[PDB]
UniProtKB/Swiss-Prot annotation, chains A, B, C, D:
GO terms for cellular component: host cell cytoplasm. The keyword Hydrolase applies. This is Uncoating factor OPG117. GO terms for molecular function: ATP binding; helicase activity; hydrolase activity. Multifunctional protein required for genome uncoating and replication. Major viral uncoating protein that is required for the release of the viral genome from incoming viral cores containing the viral DNA genome. Possesses an ATPase activity that is required for hexamerization and uncoating. ATP binds at G183, E184, T185, A186, T187, G188, K189, S190. The keyword Hydrolase applies. Residues 22-149 are annotated as: Primase. Its main location: host cell. Keywords: ATP-binding, Helicase, Host cytoplasm, Hydrolase, Nucleotide-binding. The lineage of its organism: Viruses, Varidnaviria, Bamfordvirae, Nucleocytoviricota, Pokkesviricetes. It is an enzyme of class 3 (hydrolase). Homomultimer; hexamer. Interacts with OPG148. Its EC number is 3.6.4.-.
Amino acid sequence: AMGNKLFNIAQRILDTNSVLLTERGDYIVWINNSWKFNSEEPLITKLILSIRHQLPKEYSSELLCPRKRKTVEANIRDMLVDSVETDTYPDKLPFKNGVLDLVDGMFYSGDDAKKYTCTVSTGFKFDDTKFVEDSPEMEELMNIINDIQPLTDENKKNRELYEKTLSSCLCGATKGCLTFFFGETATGKSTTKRLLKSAIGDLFVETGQTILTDVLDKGPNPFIANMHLKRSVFCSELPDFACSGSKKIRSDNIKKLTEPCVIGRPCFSNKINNRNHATIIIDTNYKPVFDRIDNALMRRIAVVRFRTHFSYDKVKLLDEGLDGKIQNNRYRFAFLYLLVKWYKKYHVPIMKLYPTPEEIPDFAFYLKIGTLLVSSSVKHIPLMTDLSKKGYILYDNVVTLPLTTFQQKISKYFNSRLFGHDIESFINRHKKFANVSDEYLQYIFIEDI
Amino acid sequence: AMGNKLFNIAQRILDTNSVLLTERGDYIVWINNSWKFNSEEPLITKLILSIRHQLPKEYSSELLCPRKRKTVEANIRDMLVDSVETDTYPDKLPFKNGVLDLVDGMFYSGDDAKKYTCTVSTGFKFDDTKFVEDSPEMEELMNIINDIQPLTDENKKNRELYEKTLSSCLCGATKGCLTFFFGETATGKSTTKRLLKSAIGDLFVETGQTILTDVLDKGPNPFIANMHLKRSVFCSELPDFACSGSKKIRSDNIKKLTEPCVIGRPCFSNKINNRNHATIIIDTNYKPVFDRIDNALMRRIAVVRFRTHFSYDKVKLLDEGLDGKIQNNRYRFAFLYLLVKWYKKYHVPIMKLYPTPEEIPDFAFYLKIGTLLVSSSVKHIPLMTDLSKKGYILYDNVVTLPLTTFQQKISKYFNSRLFGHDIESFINRHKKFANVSDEYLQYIFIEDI
Amino acid sequence: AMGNKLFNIAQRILDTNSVLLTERGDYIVWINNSWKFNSEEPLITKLILSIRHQLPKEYSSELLCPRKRKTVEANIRDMLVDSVETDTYPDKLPFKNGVLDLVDGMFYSGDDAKKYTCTVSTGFKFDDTKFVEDSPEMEELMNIINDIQPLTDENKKNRELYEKTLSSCLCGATKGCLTFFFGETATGKSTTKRLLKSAIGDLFVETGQTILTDVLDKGPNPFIANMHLKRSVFCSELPDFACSGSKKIRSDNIKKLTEPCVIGRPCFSNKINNRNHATIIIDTNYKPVFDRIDNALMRRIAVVRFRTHFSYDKVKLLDEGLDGKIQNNRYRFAFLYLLVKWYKKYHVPIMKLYPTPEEIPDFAFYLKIGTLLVSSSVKHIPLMTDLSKKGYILYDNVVTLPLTTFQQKISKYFNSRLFGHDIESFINRHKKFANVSDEYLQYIFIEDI
Amino acid sequence: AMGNKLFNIAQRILDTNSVLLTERGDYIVWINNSWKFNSEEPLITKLILSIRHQLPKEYSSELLCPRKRKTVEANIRDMLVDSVETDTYPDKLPFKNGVLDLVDGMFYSGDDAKKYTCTVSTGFKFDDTKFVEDSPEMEELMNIINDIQPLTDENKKNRELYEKTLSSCLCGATKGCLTFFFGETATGKSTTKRLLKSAIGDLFVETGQTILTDVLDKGPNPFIANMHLKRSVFCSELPDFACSGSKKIRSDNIKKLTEPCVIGRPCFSNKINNRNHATIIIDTNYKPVFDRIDNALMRRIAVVRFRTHFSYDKVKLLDEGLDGKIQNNRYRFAFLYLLVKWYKKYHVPIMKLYPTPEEIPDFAFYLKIGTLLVSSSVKHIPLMTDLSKKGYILYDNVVTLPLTTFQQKISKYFNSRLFGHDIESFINRHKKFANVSDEYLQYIFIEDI
């Protein structure tokens, strides 16, 4: 003994596509020009109460009743079967008033933004009037950024990489190459972090050294749970790697947070499948030291140096009143305009994240090795005719070089006194013993091919 | 004071067999040509709302009411008594549009797929138009795979085993022999993993070294919980086994993940009985080192080597743009067609997984021992007439060989300098002491029978 | 089959804005001139029962029914969509009778206080009659405070900083500089803590050494959960830092509790985003010793010394009966008046928290270093023409000073015998090796520019 | 479609103030002359069913219905807004028949006790007939107590302190000074504990060494949760402090359980704010040894010695049948009368708890130090004219005494052989080094002022 019109109301509600079912089995609603979502309290009832006005008068009176409204909510829940995924596009930026595009830079609102289904938003209302380049705040922030990173040819590559990383912080896609902020304390890294956080609102997230030094997938992991559906990750607090007791940046962790779907359990929920749209920028004051080094990690890591102090490459005075404007979001829209311009300059139309392993001594050593230490293969076997008199003894049909000769030759190209531990670790990892003592390495110099 | 027609509606719904009760006490529904299932929210109400159209007009109006719909759902729950198990067949591949067969290669959809009850699906809609061999993507992917594994007689066995393992990744049956991917970094293992994951969608799963180096059944285990009802398991991140601190591949774990029903507790649920349909491929860069070695493990382990680098057996240049096509699923259906062809070539009509222990030095040593070190028995007792003058002293009615003689003879067939630790461990594990010092081993050479 | 007038009642209730939805997804109500809030039991029903009197007679009779009242509560929950944040203003002090302003010192009540949405309150009813300067309690408490901190020129800076910190305890904004209470046992720190707690009621909170010596974000953290939305944090029980086993004040923790939004998980709830409005005063009896020292921490730390004992700078007799008046809140409103006067004197109109690192020997050493040890840069490279004969050898295009020369010169300005460990730690942290032994530091004296 | 009279019934119920809302958000009821309270099951329905008799006949018939009774309960819950706190008075003792006053010694019952809102009760019905001094049980118990503590001038102070502590066990206020029971095994401490427990019923609580030797605020803490709203805490089982492995009585814990509101988390509930009305008596057999010693702790600790054994100051025979009478509560009301008389003698009208640190050798040493070792100050600087020739060298404008002179002088007043460890710890804690070796202490003898 119930009503029949309520199913028609539910069908009309589903016609507008104002409520969608996520791939995680959660229901989202489109209210106040924003895809609001809440797993704890279902927002379907609020959606119905909101959109009662967009329906004929014969239905709003029916929807005024909470019993009938819950009935319509149940009907909508039954009708939503296809678990349509959301947040597909990486080139759209959601706001509290709509969605701002990164391709053309135009801001959408209302039903134009409704075409996009964003799980989150920037956390503040968009303002085109404040989103203009012709403003004193824009010039002030441009000068501040140029102080942080000079527009000099010596810093040209570093400045360009810094701009590319800050622009990629906008993109809602998987990060292809981790980025590091190298320098000293208060060299511009913290100011950049604060400006980016103020610009992107709730999309920003900050964390410590846990994800870089500890195991991620072990029971609950609130850090990874919060990092999901984010736009940028800032990892500060890195320890003195030379000093004892400081954990290394685990390459397993780096390979873990470089995938579209990163595992990790949230708190009292099943959300292990996490979408990773965040540009992870690591704030540190020392040169990074890792546990495992290989070509994949060297292609996964970019380094942005900071060489300008504010009491290096340039020394200026401290601006104590700068932080107050950042906390008041004075340079929020100016920084957003700068980020949009950088995205248009670099990442439009294709996202690009190229590594800079040459900025790390360990990765530079490994690259200079891999260039001159190509691994032996079947194609290298016919080189024995010339390598027999060059010290290469053929062991197990592999061109093998004696350890003593390998060390005497690697001391010629690398500073053995500076690279002592690195050479020792490379030898201990990549050497093979003939019987007990005739230790050899299966790598051939270019000068011997 | 309720209705009587609702029970008739429930009986009609159960006539179509659109809702089934699993062996785990969970209810599945058949909506949108897919066996959708959800333990959190019962999908029976959605099933009724969907199939109201497949019923006379006198019943759809009744079903429009959520109260009566919940009543029908309760009736269906009461009527479902026989806990019919699902996912029986290993030769069927489920899709978002139906089920693709591996016997004939024909794709079923609609009620044809409804005959099959698949707990999961590949996670994407099937497309026969893209599932064709006559396509440029197929040729490109064939060339890429041939680069990863050449079609050479020297690599013929390795390539054939690699194809067999990738085809067995499709089969929804228990794995009979674990498979290893041996090589260096970025030798083709990661590309194969990405291609297989893109091809099989949600059926793919990836994990670390925990299941291979740690204890599985200890409280909650989300890894095993996710691995259930899967088609393939990829285990990357294996440590340098020669270096200290790196755990060994526990043979107990290997024997644990080689059964149709593998124990392991999920998170806040009772699903310890897990169906294992996954082909576990282990990505590593070193030769594996285990904790326990025996004939069962040697028959449980297959090794697929990778001998082609992309800057070995062949060295080529790097294709940086290859990963973008994989992430865009350009070679998804081409890889699926290749997998289907391999399954037809090898696993049709009978699944076969034969071990290759000869690719591991430890297993090769153990096999060469077991051939020449047959254990003494009652049948070997009458050999004493000839073995008394051959050094075999009869102890406890067992043909016993002195430890010194055993070592002096095992040094003849095995390189003692290379196999020092292996011989020492075998002696310490399989020797017996006569009184305190006349240590003997209960094994006889073939040259002495 | 329900009523239509109930939605009109809900609309009238929402017209008064007596119920708001927080950013945390929680509902607050305005009853008895106070923004009462409870996550466990929804107070909306109580709000409706209270404000039935502020509605026409045709609606109070409807609201007398708990069924209709729950219906109206559901309607209000549906109508509350915009998650309006609360506790914006830092210059307003909430009471059980209203809100007391810090700008003009006038107390608001009723609808005047309703304009302000305070999550918490001082926990006691305001009394303007007791909030007067012309009272014997005010003079007694002024004399007591002057005994605790004399109004002498030698103590002028310390007394002024103490007053500024106690006034900032009122402000509901983020703390910009941590404050320390240094002295001996019962030198006035405990009396100040008790007086401040009695003055500010529930806004006060006290904790131990856990947040200063341990990791905050690790699972549940009831300390941080209680510290949220607070006005002041008192950290007593600091250990003897010279003695072994005593943990150092972690600079990571200090940087953690200096942000408007501090992470940390509560008990069985999702409230990791915590608003930090608390002035953290650390009660200690020793000079602090930290794990990491830098300019940011030196700008984050202020020190208030206590130099007057009550049996230093002054010694008096003990007042045993003082604590009884504090526990009876005799000097509650007098201390509140003093705090308001201090806030008007210092923090009106702008909150200011300036560090005093010169009160810590470690920070004084670091400041005297950083003044005379400016780091080398590109601008310092052209100084080589004069620094070549001054001992500065150019290494890697950096002005480098030998370690022996650096030590022989740092012994001239700092007492090496007193600063032995500090100099050793600074050398071990900031030195670089040329090859193996020619250790250098990249810092230049002012006398050499 | 409900009734209107039910709200009138709820208003009449709230008129009697038979149900109150606690500060913890819990509801209490007044049934059977007792403020019964239960967080698990709301007792409001039972209260309504009980007080239906105190209402006109037109309302009891309405209240007979459980549906209408639950409706009235909901109305009462809505009407209870002001979270009135309970258990204010420290001078009232609750019983199962009412409340017994400590000021005049008169027992209240019915509505007279209803004026008082006690969270707990003594757990047994009061009996004025058994609450008389003229009874053989009173004389027997007086003789037993005099055996436990003689009425001798040598024991006069100890007996008086023991009586004061036992009387303060009645007071429902915060303890101002911790009390210790010192002696040997079965010297009267256990008998006193049993008698007090039998006298005060459920108000008594007993615990081990955890709260005195471990950290309180670490997750759940059922000990502190049970100790809340109690009248006395007995801590037995103290270990041999001289032996290794025995934890010290943490002064941090002592300062923690000496506040009206003591933190500590209960089990699966939010009751961290705990009211501490309990007199904590510590049962031990050794002299206490602490981790931190200062004037605050010396003023926080009282010691009651036991010097009469029952096979010291007196030795008698064992009364084996004494415990049976205690377990049968024969001396319950006699002990209650004795406690009331002691409260009238000492704590009426003002609660007093004065420390006795002279009973502990460590505290006696510290007091004798602090008398003769007044810390140097600015007022002590002008004493340099006479202290320059007395060995006091002026360092950093502080009167400093050499360590060798300090030791040679402290050996004159204290037995250095007995106080070796104490003097060593005091030196290691309170000394300062001039440069590396000229160690000094900033304390001046009285003989030098």
